[model samples]
Target: MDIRALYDEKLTTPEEAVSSIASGSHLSMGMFAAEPPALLKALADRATRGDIGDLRVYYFETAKIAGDTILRYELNNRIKPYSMFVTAVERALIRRGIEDGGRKVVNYVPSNFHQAPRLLAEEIGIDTFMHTVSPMDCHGYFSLGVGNDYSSRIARSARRFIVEVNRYMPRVQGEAAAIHISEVDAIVENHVPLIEMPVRSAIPEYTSISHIIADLVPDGACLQMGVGALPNLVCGVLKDRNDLGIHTEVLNPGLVDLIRRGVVTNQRKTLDRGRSVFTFAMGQQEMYEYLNDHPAIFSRPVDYVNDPHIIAQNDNVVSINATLQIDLTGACNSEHMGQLDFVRGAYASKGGRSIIATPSTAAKGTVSRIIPRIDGPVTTPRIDTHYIVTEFGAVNLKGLSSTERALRIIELAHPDFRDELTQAAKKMHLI
Candidate 1:
C-alpha cells in the first residue's frame, strides 16, 4: 500500500485529519513533545461545530501547544480529560462549574503511566488511539520518536490506529517496543516543529525546599523526579553529594547539568544498575541534545519507571514529589483550590508514592497551602501518604492515625495558617 495516499494529497491542516473522528469516541493522544497538535485542534474545531459529543480524551501532562484551547473544549462537555497533569486544569474546570452536579471532566486515575496502555488493552474501551511518529524506515517501521511512553502498548491494543507521520520529529531510541507504519489504519503526514521547554532556573522556594530534601538523601540513594523547577533545583543542590542514581519518567535539561557534575552516575541503583533509566526525555534543546545518541541513558517505559511495588524494591528509594496543597489531615489537594468554579481539572501527577522524601505544600503567602480540609479532589489519597515536607519541616504521615497525622501536618503548615488549621481540626473532632 502507498503510505503517502493515507493522508490524501492536500491535507493542509490538523483539523482535516482529525475531523474524521465521529461522536461518542474514546481517544487517547500522545503527550509531551510528541503530542499530536493537529489532531487535537481538529477535534476542538469539530466540537465547536457541534459535530461531536461525549468524546473522552485521555492524556498526561498539559505541556502542549495550545493547551488552554483544549481546556476550553473540555469545559463544554465535548471533551473529557483524565486528570494526572497539573492542578490548574482542574481548578479552571471547577470554576466553570463543568464538574458540578456529578458531571466530571476527569475519569478513573490509572495506577501509573504503564497501566494506561494495559488498561486500554483490557478493553477498558478505547475507540481510537492517536499518536505522532518520525518517518517510516526502509522496513516500514516508525519510531514513536519523542514519546514511546504508551504508544507501543496502546498500538498493540487499539482497534483503530491513528498515526501522524512527521518528518521533522527525531528518530530517538525508546524503552518500549516500536511499531510498524504499515500497521496503522490512518496516517497523516505533517511537518511541524518538535515541542520544546525552556531552561528553568531554580525558583527561590524551590531552592529552599531542595536544600531540605537533598539533606535527607544519602550518597547511594536512588533518585526519581519529574521535570519541573523543584526537581531541577533538587538535582542542582545534590551536586555536592555523592553517587546518586536516577530511574524516572523523563529526563530534563536540569538533570543533564547534574549528571555533568557527576551527581547522577547511577552507579549505585539496585535496578538497571549503573545506567540512568527513564521513559522519555522532554525539555529545551539542551536536554534533547544530551539524550541524542547517548547510551548511558535508557529511555524505558513507565511500568519500570513508576511501579510503586517495583520502586519499593530499590533500597533508599527517594521519591521526591511536588504538591499544590496539603490539608491538616495529610489529605493532598493537588487538583483544586476550593469548590467547583474555582478550577475545572484535577491536578494529578503520574507518581505520588513516597518511599522517602516528604509531603509538601506551596503557594503564595496570601494563601495557606495547608488547610483543615481540601476543597478539591484528593489526587494523592491519604492511605499512600508518607512524608509531608515544606520549608517549615517534614512530616511523615505513614503509619500515623488520622488524628495524629492532622496534628503533625498542622505543625509543618505555614506559621500564619497553623492556628486556623488547628482550630478547624478541633472543630472536626480530629484532635
Candidate 2:
C-alpha cells in the first residue's frame, strides 16, 4: 500500500489511539522530549475509569506533562511505571510510596544506556511503542525528533507503533532518525509545546570540581558528560578552551553555549569528525532550536553513541560523570540512580579517563559521601575508577594500593569529615 494511504488509515484521536492499550499490555513510551503528552493524558484519563489493570509502562527521563499524569493516584493501580532512568518527579513519587507503605508503582531498572534497546525488545517484550514525532514529511516519514535513543529500535521491534504528530518536533538528522508511515499503526495530533529543562545556577562546589576536571582535559579532547549540574559546570568552565569536541550521551544548554562561543570545533575528533555526536538532546528551548537542521550536530542511537570501542577511537577521551557516594577504596555508588554502565563504557575506552564528581557530603554535611567502606552496592568497581573529584580536591586512584587509595580518597572528603573517616579507615584496616 502507498505511504500516504497507510498514514491516512492510521490517523486517529489520542483517546482512540490509547484505547488499544488493555490490561496487562506492555507499553514503551519515547524518552524525554519525544514522550507523547496527549496520548499519555488520554491513558491516564482512561485509568480513572478503573478498567485498565496492571499495565506496565517503560520509559526514561519523562517530561513534565507525562510525568504529572503518571504520578497521579488515580492511575497508580492501572499503570505500573518501570523507569530505566529516574527523574526528579519519579524519585519523589517512589519516596512517597515507600513512606505510605503503598505498592511501589515506580520501579527502576539499572541499565547501561547502550543496552536499552536489547532490554526492551528481548527482555521486556514491549508490545506497543508510543512517542511524539514530527509531522509526516512528503515521503510519509516521521522523524523521532529530539529522542532517537531507543525509540527507533522499539518502533521497529514492537508489535504495534502509535505516534503523536507534533508540529514543534524538530526534524533531527542521523541514522534510524525517521520511521516510515507504514511502520506506524496509529497517529494522534498533538500541538503542545515541548518541555524544557530550567537553567541551573552554578553551585560553588560544582564550579570548583569543574575547574579541577577542566585542568585535566586537553585542548583537543573529545568529552562525554552525563546529565546534571556538575557536567554543565564542566562545560561552562571549558568555554575558553580551543578545538574541543563533543561525543556525549545528552546534549545540554552549556554545550550549546560552548558551540556558540566557538569552543567546540569538532575538528580533532577521531570519530564523527566535524560533527558533535550525541544520542539525545535535553535542555532549554534555545538548545533545541540550535539542533534544528544543524549540520554540526548529529543525533545517533544509543548503541552507536555509547559504544566503548567507538568512544575509544577519539584522542584523549575524557568522561566526567556524577555519583551519589564513594568508598575510601575508590568504589562508587552511581548505580542506585542508574548510569553505572555508561561509566563502565567510558572507563573501558582505550586511553580514556573516567572522572566521578560529587560533593563531599550529603544532607547538608550530616553524611559524608566518602566513607571508610561501601556499606551498600558497588556501582563502579575500583578497577574502573580513575579519578574521583570533589569540592575539596581531585584524586586519581588508578595505580594506588588499597591503603594509598584510602588516603587519597580521604583527602578528597570534607575537612570536617577527614579525621573521622581516617579513624574509620584505620579501624577497618583500609589505611
Candidate 3:
C-alpha cells in the first residue's frame, strides 16, 4: 500500500476538513496547546455564514487563556461552547455573552479529569474529535504531541476524526499518544507557531501559602502541582528537597525546571519508575522544547494519570492545587473541585496528603474567598478534604466533626470574615 499517497489524498483545507460537521453534532477539540486553531477558525467562519447552528463544541483549556480572536463570542449562537475545564478565555466569553443579552453561551461540564474520556465516550457521545498533531512519521503515525489528555482515547473512537498537522508541534510519546494514518478521516496543515503558556508575576499571598504547603510536604515525595503561579511558587520553596517525583495531570514549566535542577528524580514512584508521568503538557516555549523527545518525562492518557488506583500505587503521593473557594463547612466550588477530589481520594488511600491552598480574599480583599456556605454545587465533600491553607494558616480537616471542621476552616479565612463566618456557622448549628 502507498502510505504517502493515502496521506496526500487525506490532506485537505481547513474548511473542507470541517465541512462534514452538521448542526447539533457533538464536537470536541484539542485541549490547551493542542487546540487546532485553523480548523476552529474555519468552523467559526462557517457559523458566521449561517451554515451550522447549535453545534455542541466541547473543549478544555486553550492557548487563549487571556482571550483570542479565532473563537469569538458572536459565534456562541451557532456553537454553544462547553468546557470540561473552564479557563480565563471561556469565562470572559461566557460573561461577555451574558452581559450583552443574558444568553447562556459558554458553560462547563462537571466531570473528574480522570473520567473525562468515559464521559465523552459513554455518556455524552462524541460525533467528531479534532486536534493538532505532529507531522506524519515514516511509519504513517502522527503523535498527538502537546496534548494526549482525553483526546488520545477519543481520537481512536470518535465517529469523525480529524487532525491539523503542524511541523512545530513536538512529536510526543506516551500511552495512546499516536494515531495511524488509516485511523484519521481528514488532515489539515497549519504552519503557525504553537501557543505558549503565559508568564505570571509573583503574588504576596501565594508566597506565604507556598511556604505553608511546602513545610507540610516531606522529602522524596511524588507531587501533583495543579495549575497557575502559586503551585509553581511551591516548587521554588521545595528546591532543596531531593528524590521528588512528578505524577501529575498537567506538566508545566515549573515541573520541567525541577527536573532540570535535579529535584524530581522520579526514582521513588511506585508506577512508571524513573519517569515523570503526566497526561498533558502546557507551558512556555522552553518547557515545550524540554519535553520534545525527552526520555525522562512520559505522557499518558488522563485515566491513567488521574486515576485514583494508579496514583495510589505510588507511595508518599501529595496532590496540591490553588483551588477556587471553600465554605466554612468545607464544600468546594465544583469547577476545580471535581477533578481534585480524585487526587484527594488517591493520596488519602496511599497514606499521603492532599492540600488545597487559596488566597483568603478576592477582588483585592473586599470579599472573602472562604465563605459561609456554597450556593452552587459542591464538587468535593467535606469528608474528602485533608488540609486547607491560606495566607493566614493551614488546617487539617481530617478526623474533624462538622463543628470542628467549621472552626478550623474559619481560622484559615480572612480576619474580616472570620467572625461573620462563625456567626453564620452558629446559625446553622455547625459551630
Candidate 4:
C-alpha cells in the first residue's frame, strides 16, 4: 500500500477537516502542548455557523488554546467541554458559570490521571480523536510528539482520528508516540507555536513551607510532585540534594532544572533506574527541547507511571502535593480541584510518605483553612494523611487520636487563626 500517497490524499484545510463532526458526537482532544489551535478555531467557527450542536469534548490539562475555544461562552450549547484535570482558565470559567446559574461551559470529570484513558474508552467511548502532532516522517508516521499522555491510548480506541500537523511540536521519544498514516482519517496543516507555562517565582510563604517539606525528604529518595508554585518551591530548595529520582505524573520545568544540575541522578530508584519516568509534560520551551529524543527520560502511559504497585517498589518514595484545605481531624480536600485518585495512589504506596502542603489561610487571612470540621466531601481521609505543612509549621498526623490530631493541626495554622481554631476544636470536644 502507498502510505505516503494516502497521507497526501487525507490532507485538507482545517475547516474542511472539522466539517465531518456531527452534532452529539463524542470528541476527545489532546492535552497540554498537544492542543490543536487551528482545528479548534475551525471547530469554534463551525459552532458559530450552527453546523454542529451538543458535541461532547473530553480533554485534560487544557492549554490557553482550548480555553479560547471549548471553554468560551459562544459555544455554550453547541459544545460541552469536560476536563479530567482542571487548569487555571477552566477553573475561572467553571466558577463564573456556577455564579450565573446557567449551563456550565466547562465541567470537570472526577478521575485519576492514570485511569483517564480507561474511563474514556470503556465508559465514555470516544467517537472521534483529534489533536496536534509533528509532521509525517519518511515512514509515513506522525508523532504524537509532546503529548503521549492519553492520546496514544485513545487514538487506538476511537473510531475516527484527526490531527493538526504542527511544525513546532518536538518529535518526542516514547512508546505509542507515533501513529501510522493509514490509521488517521483527516489531517490539517497548521504551524502555530506551542503554549508555554510561565515560570513561577517563589514567595516568602512558599520558601518557608519548602524548607520544612524539604527536611522530610532524605538522600537517595524517589520523588513525585504535583504542579504549582509550592511544588516548584520545594524543587528549588532540593536543588543541592544528592541522588534524587523522579517518577512523576506530569514533568515540569522545575524537574528539568534538577536534571540539568545533576541533582536527579535517578540511580537510586528501585524501578526504572537511571531514568526519569513521566506520562506527559507541560512547561517552558527549554524543557520541551530537553525531552526531544532524550534516552534518559521514559515518557510512558499514565497506567504504568502512576500505578500504586509500581510506585511502592521504590524505597523512600516521597509524594509532595498541594491541598486546598485540611480539617482539624486531618481530613483533606484535594479532590475538589480534580486530584483524587492520583494522590490516593501515591499515599497508599508502601514506605511512601505523603506530604500535604498549603497556605495557613485564604481570602487574605480572613478565613482559616484548618477548619474544626469539613462540612463538604472529604478527598483524603484521616487514615491516608501522613504529614501536613504550612508556612507556620509542619505536623505528622500518623498514629494520632482526634484530640492529638487537632492539637498538631492547630499548631500548623497561622498565628492569627490559631486561637480561633483552638476555640472551635475545644467546642467540638476535639481537644
Candidate 4, poorest ten consecutive residues by summed lDDT: 335-344
Give the CA lDDT, 0 to 100, for residue 84 in model 4.
Answer: 75
Query: Please, what are the lDDT tens digits per residue for candidate 1 over residues 370-411?
Result: 778877578666766666578777766767987989888888
lDDT of 2 by residue, 109-188 (tens): 87777889889999989988898888888888888888888877998898889999988887777778888888889999
Q: Model 4 lDDT vs. the true structure?
A: 0.82
- What is candidate 4's CA lDDT for residue 181? 84
lDDT of 1 at 361: 40
Per-residue lDDT of 230-346 in model 4, one digit per residue for the tens? 998788899899899998878887787888888998998988898988778888777877776677777677777778777777777888889889999989986444234345555
Q: Which candidate is the best by TM-score?
A: 2
Candidate 4, 198: how far from true, in Å? 3.2
**CA error at residue 25 for candidate 3, angstroms:** 2.5
**For each candidate, what is the lDDT?**
0.64, 0.82, 0.82, 0.82
Better of 2 and 3 by TM-score: 2
Error of model 4, residue 93, in angstroms: 4.1
What would the TM-scores of all predictions be?
0.77, 0.92, 0.91, 0.92
Clashing pairs in 4: none
Candidate 3 lDDT over residue span 1-431, tens digit each: 57799899999999999888988889987788888888888888898899988888776775662135245887777778777777767777878877887877677887777888889888899999988999999999999987888899899768999999998888888887878899999999997777887688877898999999998887678888776899899989888989999888888877888999999999988788889988888887777767777778878998888877787788888888766788977977636423564446445545577888889998888998899898767666777777888999898877888999899899889999999999999899997
